[PDB]
Structure formats: C-alpha cells, structure tokens
PDB file of C-alpha atoms and ligand atoms in Angstrom:
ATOM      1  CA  UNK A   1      -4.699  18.443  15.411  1.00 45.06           C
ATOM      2  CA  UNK A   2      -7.880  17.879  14.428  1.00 43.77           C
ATOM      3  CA  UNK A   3      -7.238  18.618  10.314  1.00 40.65           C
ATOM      4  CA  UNK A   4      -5.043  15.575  10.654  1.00 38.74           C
ATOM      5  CA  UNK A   5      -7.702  13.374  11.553  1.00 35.91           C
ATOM      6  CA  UNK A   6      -9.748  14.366   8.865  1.00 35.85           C
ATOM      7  CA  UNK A   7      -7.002  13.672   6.567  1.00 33.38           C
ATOM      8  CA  UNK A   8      -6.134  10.132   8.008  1.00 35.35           C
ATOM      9  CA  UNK A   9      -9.767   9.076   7.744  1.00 35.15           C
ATOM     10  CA  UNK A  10      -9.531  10.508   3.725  1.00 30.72           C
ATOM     11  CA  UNK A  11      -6.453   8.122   3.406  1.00 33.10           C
ATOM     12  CA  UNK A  12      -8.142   5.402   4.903  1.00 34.71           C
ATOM     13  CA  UNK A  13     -11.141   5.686   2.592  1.00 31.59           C
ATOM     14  CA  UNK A  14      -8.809   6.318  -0.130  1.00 28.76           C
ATOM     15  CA  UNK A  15      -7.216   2.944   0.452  1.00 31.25           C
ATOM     16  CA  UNK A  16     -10.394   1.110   0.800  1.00 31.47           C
ATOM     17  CA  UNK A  17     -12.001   2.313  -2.294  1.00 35.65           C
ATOM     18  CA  UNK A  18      -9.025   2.057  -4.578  1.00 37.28           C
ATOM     19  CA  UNK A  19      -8.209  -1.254  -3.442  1.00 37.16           C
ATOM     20  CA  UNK A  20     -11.956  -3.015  -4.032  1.00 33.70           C
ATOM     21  CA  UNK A  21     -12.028  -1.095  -7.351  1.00 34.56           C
ATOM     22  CA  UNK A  22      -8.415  -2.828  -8.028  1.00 36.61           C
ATOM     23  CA  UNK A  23      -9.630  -6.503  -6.282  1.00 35.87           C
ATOM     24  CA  UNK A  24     -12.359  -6.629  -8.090  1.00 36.78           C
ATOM     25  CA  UNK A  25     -10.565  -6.484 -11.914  1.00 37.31           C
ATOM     26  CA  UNK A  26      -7.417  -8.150 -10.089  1.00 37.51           C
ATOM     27  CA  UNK A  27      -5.156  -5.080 -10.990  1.00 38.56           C
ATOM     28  CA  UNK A  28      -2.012  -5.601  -8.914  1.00 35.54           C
ATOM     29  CA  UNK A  29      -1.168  -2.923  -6.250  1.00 36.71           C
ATOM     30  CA  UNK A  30       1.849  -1.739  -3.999  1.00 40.07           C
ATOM     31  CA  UNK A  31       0.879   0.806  -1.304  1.00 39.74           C
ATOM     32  CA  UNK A  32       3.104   1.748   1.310  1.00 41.48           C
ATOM     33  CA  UNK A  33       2.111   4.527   4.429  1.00 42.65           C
ATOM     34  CA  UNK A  34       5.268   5.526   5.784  1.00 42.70           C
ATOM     35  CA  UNK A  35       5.054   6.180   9.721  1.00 42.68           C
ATOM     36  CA  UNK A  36       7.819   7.461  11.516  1.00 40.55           C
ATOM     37  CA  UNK A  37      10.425   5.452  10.476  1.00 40.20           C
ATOM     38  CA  UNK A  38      11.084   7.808   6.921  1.00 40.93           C
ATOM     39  CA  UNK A  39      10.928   6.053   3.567  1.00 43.93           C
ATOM     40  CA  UNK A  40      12.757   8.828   1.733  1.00 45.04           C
ATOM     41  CA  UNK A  41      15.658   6.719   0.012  1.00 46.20           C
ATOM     42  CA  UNK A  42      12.775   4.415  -1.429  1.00 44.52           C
ATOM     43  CA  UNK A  43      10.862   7.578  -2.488  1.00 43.66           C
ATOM     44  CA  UNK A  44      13.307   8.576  -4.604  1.00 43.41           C
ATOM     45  CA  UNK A  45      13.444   5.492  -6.656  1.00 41.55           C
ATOM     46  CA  UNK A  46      10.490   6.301  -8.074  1.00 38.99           C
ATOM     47  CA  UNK A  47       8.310   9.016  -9.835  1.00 40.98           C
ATOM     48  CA  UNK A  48       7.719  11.700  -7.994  1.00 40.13           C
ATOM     49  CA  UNK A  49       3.860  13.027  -7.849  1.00 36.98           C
ATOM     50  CA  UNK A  50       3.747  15.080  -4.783  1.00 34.92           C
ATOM     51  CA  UNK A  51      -0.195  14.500  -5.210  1.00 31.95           C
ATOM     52  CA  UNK A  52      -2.990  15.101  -3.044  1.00 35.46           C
ATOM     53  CA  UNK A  53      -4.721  12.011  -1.986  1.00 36.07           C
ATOM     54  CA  UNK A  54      -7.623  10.241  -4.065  1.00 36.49           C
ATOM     55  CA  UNK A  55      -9.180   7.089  -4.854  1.00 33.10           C
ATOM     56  CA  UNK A  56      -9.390   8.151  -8.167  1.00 36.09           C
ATOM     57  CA  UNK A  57      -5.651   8.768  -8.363  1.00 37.16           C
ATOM     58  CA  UNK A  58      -4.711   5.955  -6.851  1.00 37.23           C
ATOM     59  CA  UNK A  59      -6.755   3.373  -9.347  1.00 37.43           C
ATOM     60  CA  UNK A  60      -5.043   5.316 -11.857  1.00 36.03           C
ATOM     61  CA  UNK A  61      -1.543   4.889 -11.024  1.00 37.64           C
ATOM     62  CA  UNK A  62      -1.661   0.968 -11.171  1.00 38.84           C
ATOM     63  CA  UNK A  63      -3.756   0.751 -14.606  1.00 39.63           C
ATOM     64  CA  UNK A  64      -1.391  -1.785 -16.059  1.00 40.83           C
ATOM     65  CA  UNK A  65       0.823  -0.943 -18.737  1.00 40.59           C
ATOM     66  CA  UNK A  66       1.123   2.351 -17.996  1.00 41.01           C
ATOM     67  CA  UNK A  67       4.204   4.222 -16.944  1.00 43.41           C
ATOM     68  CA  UNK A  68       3.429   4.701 -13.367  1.00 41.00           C
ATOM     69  CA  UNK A  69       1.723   1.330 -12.278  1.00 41.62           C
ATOM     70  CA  UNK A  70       5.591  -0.948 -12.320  1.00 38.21           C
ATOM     71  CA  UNK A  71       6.312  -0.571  -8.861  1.00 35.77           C
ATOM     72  CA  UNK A  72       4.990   0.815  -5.015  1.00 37.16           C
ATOM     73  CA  UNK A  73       3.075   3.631  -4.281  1.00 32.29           C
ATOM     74  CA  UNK A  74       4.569   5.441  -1.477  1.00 30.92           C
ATOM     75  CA  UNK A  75       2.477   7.745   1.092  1.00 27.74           C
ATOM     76  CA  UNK A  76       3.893  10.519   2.778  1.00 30.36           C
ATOM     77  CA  UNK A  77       2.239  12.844   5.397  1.00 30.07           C
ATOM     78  CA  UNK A  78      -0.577  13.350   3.583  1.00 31.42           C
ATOM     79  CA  UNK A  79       0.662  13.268  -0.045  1.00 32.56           C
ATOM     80  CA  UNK A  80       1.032  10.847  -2.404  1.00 32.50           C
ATOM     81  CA  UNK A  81       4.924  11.152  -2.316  1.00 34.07           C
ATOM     82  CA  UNK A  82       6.161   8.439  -5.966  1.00 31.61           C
ATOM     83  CA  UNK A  83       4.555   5.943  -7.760  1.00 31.30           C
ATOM     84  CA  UNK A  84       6.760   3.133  -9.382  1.00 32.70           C
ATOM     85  CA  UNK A  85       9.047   3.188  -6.260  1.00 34.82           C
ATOM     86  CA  UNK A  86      11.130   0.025  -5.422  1.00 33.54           C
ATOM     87  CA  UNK A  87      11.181  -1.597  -1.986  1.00 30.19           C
ATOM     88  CA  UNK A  88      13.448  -4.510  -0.539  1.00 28.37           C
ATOM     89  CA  UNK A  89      12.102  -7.943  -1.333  1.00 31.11           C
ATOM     90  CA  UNK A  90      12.544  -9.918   2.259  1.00 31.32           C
ATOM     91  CA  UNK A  91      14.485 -13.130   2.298  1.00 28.32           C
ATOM     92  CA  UNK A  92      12.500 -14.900   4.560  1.00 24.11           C
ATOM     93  CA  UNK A  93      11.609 -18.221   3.971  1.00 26.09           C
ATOM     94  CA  UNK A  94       8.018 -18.831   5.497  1.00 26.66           C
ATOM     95  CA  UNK A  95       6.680 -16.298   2.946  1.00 28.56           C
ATOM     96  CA  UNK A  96       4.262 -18.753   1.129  1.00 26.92           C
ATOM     97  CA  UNK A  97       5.575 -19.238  -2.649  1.00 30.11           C
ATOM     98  CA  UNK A  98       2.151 -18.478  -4.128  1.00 29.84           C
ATOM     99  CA  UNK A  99       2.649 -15.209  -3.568  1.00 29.43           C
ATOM    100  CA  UNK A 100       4.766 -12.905  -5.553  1.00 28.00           C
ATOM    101  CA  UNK A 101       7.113 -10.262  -5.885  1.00 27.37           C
ATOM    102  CA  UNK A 102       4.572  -7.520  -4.301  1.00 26.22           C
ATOM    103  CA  UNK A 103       4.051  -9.796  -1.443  1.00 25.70           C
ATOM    104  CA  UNK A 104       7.617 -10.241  -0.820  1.00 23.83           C
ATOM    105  CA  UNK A 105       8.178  -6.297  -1.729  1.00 24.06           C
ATOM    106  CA  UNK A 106       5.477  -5.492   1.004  1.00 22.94           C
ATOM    107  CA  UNK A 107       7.280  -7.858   3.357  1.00 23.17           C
ATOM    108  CA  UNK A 108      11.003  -6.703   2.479  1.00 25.90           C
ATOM    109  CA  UNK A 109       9.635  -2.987   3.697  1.00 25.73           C
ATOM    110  CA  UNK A 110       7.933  -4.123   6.694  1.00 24.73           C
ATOM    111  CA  UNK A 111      11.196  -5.496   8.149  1.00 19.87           C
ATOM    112  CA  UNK A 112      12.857  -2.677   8.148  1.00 18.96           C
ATOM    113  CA  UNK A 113      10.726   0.771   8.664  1.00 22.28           C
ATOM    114  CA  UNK A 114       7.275   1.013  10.387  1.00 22.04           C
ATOM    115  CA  UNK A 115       5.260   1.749   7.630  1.00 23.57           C
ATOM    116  CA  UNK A 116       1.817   0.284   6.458  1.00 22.71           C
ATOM    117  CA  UNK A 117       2.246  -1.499   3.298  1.00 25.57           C
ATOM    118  CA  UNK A 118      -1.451  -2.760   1.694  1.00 21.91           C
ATOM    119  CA  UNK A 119      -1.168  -5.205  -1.560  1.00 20.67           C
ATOM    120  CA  UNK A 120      -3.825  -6.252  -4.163  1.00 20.13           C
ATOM    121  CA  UNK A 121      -3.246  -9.313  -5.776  1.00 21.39           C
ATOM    122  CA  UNK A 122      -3.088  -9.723  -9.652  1.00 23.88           C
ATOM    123  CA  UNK A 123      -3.850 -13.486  -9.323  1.00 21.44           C
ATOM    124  CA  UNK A 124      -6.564 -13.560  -6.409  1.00 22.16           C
ATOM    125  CA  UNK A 125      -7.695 -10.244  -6.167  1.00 21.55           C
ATOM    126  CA  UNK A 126      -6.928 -10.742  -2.493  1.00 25.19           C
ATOM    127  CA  UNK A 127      -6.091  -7.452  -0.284  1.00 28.26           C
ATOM    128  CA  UNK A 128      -3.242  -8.466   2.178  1.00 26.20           C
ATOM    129  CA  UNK A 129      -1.248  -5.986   4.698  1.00 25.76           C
ATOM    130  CA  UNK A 130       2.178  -6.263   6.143  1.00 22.87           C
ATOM    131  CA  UNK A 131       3.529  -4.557   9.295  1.00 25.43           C
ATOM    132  CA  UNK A 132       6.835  -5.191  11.475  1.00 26.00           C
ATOM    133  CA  UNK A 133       7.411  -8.267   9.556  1.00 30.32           C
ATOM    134  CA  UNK A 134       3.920  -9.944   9.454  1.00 29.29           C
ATOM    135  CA  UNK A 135       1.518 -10.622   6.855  1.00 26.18           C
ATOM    136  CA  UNK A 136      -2.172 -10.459   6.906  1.00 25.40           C
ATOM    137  CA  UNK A 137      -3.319 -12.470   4.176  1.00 22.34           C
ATOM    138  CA  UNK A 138      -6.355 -11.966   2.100  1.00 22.13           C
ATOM    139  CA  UNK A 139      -8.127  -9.448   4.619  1.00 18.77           C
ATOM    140  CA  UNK A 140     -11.957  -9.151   4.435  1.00 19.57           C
ATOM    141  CA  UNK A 141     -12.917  -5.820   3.702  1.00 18.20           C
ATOM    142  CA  UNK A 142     -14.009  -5.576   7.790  1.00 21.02           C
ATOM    143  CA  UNK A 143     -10.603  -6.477   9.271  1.00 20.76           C
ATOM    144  CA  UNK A 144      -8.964  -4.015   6.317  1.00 22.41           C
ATOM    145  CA  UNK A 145     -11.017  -1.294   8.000  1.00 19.00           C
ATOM    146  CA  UNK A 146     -10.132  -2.095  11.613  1.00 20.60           C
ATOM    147  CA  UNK A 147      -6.227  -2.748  10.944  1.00 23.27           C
ATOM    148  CA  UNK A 148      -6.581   0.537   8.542  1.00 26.50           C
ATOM    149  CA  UNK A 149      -8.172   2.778  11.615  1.00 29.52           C
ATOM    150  CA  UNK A 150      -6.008   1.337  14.308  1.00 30.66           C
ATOM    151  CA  UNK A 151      -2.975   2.027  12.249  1.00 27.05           C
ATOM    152  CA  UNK A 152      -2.929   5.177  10.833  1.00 26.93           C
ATOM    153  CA  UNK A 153      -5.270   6.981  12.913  1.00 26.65           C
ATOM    154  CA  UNK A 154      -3.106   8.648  15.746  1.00 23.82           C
TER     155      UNK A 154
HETATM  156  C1  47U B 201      14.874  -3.020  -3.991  1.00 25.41           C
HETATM  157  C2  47U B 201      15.074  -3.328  -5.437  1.00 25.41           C
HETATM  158  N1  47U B 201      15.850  -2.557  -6.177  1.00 25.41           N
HETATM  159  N2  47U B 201      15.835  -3.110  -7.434  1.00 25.41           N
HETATM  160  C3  47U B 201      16.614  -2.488  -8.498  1.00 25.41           C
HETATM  161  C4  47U B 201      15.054  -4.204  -7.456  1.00 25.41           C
HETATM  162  C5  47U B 201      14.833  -5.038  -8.672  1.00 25.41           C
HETATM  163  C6  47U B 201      14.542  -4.381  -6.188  1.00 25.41           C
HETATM  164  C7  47U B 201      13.613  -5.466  -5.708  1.00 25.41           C
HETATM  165  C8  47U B 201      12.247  -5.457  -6.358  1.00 25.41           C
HETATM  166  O1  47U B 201      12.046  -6.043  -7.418  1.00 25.41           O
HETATM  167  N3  47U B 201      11.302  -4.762  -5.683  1.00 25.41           N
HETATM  168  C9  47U B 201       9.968  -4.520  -6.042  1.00 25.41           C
HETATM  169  C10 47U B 201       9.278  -5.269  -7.002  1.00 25.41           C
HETATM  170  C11 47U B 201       7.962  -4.930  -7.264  1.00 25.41           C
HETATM  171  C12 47U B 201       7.374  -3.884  -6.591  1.00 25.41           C
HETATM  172  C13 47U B 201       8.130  -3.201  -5.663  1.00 25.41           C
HETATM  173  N4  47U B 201       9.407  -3.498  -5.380  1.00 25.41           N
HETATM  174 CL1   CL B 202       0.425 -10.015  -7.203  1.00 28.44          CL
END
C-alpha cells in the first residue's frame, strides 16, 4: 500500500535524473511505464533485465553504441522489465517531421496501451512525453515532475 508509493516516487526520481543526465549530453532515450493496459508482447522484443530501478542503470542502458541502448526501455511494476524493446511507430500525420523515430515510437505505443512513454532527444536534448495519443513536447523539468506525479502515482 504504502511500499508502493515509495517505489513510484523512486521511479519518478529515477526518470528525472536519468533523463537531465541524458538531455544534457543529448543521448537519445525510449522509456515506456506500462499501466494497466500490459506491454508484455513488446517486452519480449527486447533484452530482458528484470532489474531493480536506478538512475544509474537507466543512463547506462542508452550509452550509445552499446548493446542495450538500440531501442525502448520498458517498465514493469517496479522493475526494469527489457531494454532494446521495439514499439509501434504511429501513422499519424500531425506528428511534426522534426522529430524522429523515438518520437513516433513513443507515439505508436501511446495509441494503443495506457502506458507512460518519456523520450530524450538526440538532436535537442528536449524531454517530451506521450500518453493516449498526445504529445507533450519539450517539457520543462517542472511540468515533467507534475505530469510524472499525476501519472504514476496511484
Ligand atoms: C514495431 C517494430 N518492429 N520492428 C521490427 C520495427 C522496425 C518496428 C518499428 C520501430 O522501428 N520501432 C522503434 C524504433 C526505435 C525505438 C523503438 N521502437
Ligand atoms: Cl531523437
């Protein structure tokens, strides 16, 4: 009950931290927090880590190059479930086109679970968010936090 909470907070502040030390060298990033809606098929496209939650882990996973960082990061419960996962790019059209594949990855899974999905850009550094088909571009490090807490604290 209340061990959850702890945990969501630690997952919040695991996001936030990996994603300004990611921003700020403009290291691309994939991070999807599945909800209810199960992401299991999409989990097993990927690595399996079956990791506890970190920061540290998490900047670690997309150093580029590296065998783990070519794809999404996929959080379940309270583990980090794959790394290098793949997840539907969405068709839509409005989607601006200077944005890339992550954006349109992050999109593609919004669309159809209810899952959290939090990019880093390799080109801006910019942190954007996409849920039920929406896209929060280039989110200030306040309305990260506030989107963050609404979202995945129950
Ligand atoms: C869904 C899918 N299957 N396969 C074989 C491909 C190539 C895709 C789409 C895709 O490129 N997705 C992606 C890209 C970057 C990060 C995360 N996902
Ligand atoms: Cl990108």
């Amino acid at each position: 009950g209340s061990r959850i909470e702890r945990e969501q907070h630690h997952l919040i502040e695991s996001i936030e931290k990996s994603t300004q030390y990611m921003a700020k060298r403009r290291i691309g990033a994939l991070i999807s927090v599945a909800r209810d809606t199960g992401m299991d098929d999409y989990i097993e496209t990927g690595i399996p880590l079956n990791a506890k939650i970190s920061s540290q882990l998490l900047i670690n996973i997309f150093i580029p190059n590296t065998p783990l960082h070519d794809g999404a990061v996929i959080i379940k419960g309270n583990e980090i479930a794959s790394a290098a996962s793949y997840l539907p790019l969405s068709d839509s059209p409005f989607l601006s086109k200077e944005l890339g594949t992550r954006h349109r990855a992050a999109l593609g899974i919004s669309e159809v679970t209810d899952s959290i999905t939090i990019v880093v850009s390799e080109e801006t550094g910019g942190i954007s968010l996409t849920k039920g088909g929406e896209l929060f571009r280039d989110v200030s490090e306040e309305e990260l936090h506030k989107i963050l807490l609404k979202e995945l604290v129950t």
